[PDB]
Symmetry: C6
Subunit: 63 residues, 6 copies
C-alpha cells in the first residue's frame, strides 16, 4: 500500500536517502530498485539491503 509509492517516488525523482538498519548503521545513497524483500541502494557500488533489517527510510530533504 504505502511502501511502493514512497520508494518509487524517491527512485523516480532520484532523491538521496538515509536507510537506518536495525543494527544502528546508517546507509546513504540512491534507491536503484526494490522488490518485496530487498532494496538496491547505489553509492559507489550497488548494495542489497534486506527490508527485514531496515528500521527507517529517511529522505535527505523534503520529497
Amino acid at each position: 500500500s504505502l511502501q511502493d509509492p514512497f520508494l518509487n517516488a524517491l527512485r523516480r525523482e532520484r532523491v538521496p536517502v538515509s536507510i537506518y538498519l536495525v543494527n544502528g548503521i546508517k546507509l546513504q545513497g540512491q534507491i536503484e530498485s526494490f522488490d518485496q524483500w530487498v532494496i538496491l541502494l547505489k553509492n559507489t557500488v550497488s548494495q542489497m539491503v534486506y527490508k527485514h533489517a531496515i528500521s527507517t527510510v529517511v529522505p535527505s530533504r523534503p520529497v
Copy 2:
C-alpha cells in the same frame, strides 16, 4: 480480544498527537503519524520518513489521546 493497533494509531493520527517511536535498536524517532498501513508508519517531522513496524518496539504518545 481483537484488535488494538489501528484504532490506537488512527487516534494519534487524527488528533495530531506528537509521538516517540522507539526502534528495536534503541533509536528514538519523534514526529506525527501522517499515515500507516499493515507494514509501515509514515512519520512526519521535517521530512516524511517511512518506519517499518517490524523494527518498532513501542509507540509512546507525548500526551493523552482523547
Copy 3:
C-alpha cells in the same frame, strides 16, 4: 495457551509490570489491554508495545 491467562491475571489484578524489550529497554506500568500483536501499557500515557519486540514480561512482585 499461556500468554492470555498470564497477561489477563496481571490486568484484572492490576499488577505493575516490567516489560523488557529486545533493545534492552525496560518499560514499567500497568497492563491496560492486549491482543495477539500488541500490549497497551499504561503509565502517564497509554503506550503501544509490539509483542514482536518484547523479550520478557516480569511482574514486580509475586502474582
Copy 4:
C-alpha cells in the same frame, strides 16, 4: 530429523534443572522452567516471568539433564 524443542524443555522442567536463558539483547535470565507452549516459556525465580521464544537465543542447562 524432527523434533527437539519440546523434549529438551520438558526434560529441564521435569528434572527441575536450573537454566540460563540468553536473550537476543544479550541479557541473561536465570530460573527454572515452570511451563511453556509454542510461543512462551514461564521462567520461575522469585517471580514467574513470561519469556517470548522469539527473543531467546539459547537455553543453557546449569548441569546435565538425565
Copy 5:
C-alpha cells in the same frame, strides 16, 4: 537445501564450531543434533540454540 548437509557434515565428522548469535555472543562446541528450528550444541552440557537467533555457523578449521 544447504543447511542440513552443512550441519550434518560437521555433526557426522564431529567438527568443533563457532556459532555467532544475533546478540554478538559466540558459542563454541560440537553439533549434537538439529532440526528445522534448533541446534543442540554440546560443550560441558547440551544447550539448545534457536536458529532464528543464529547469524553464522563457522567451522573452527576447514571441513
Copy 6:
C-alpha cells in the same frame, strides 16, 4: 517488480566478487559467495561459513559487478 535477490547474489558468485556482509548485530563478514539458497548463504574465506539470511542487513560488493 519481482525479483532481485537471486540475480544479485548469483552475479557476485559467478564473477567471484569479494563481498562484505553486514549482520544485524553489526558484525562485518568478508569473503566470496560460494553458494546460497532461500535461507542461507555459504561465505568462503579461509573456511566456508553458513550465514542465515534472516541475520543479514546488507550485502556490499567490494567492486562493481558487470
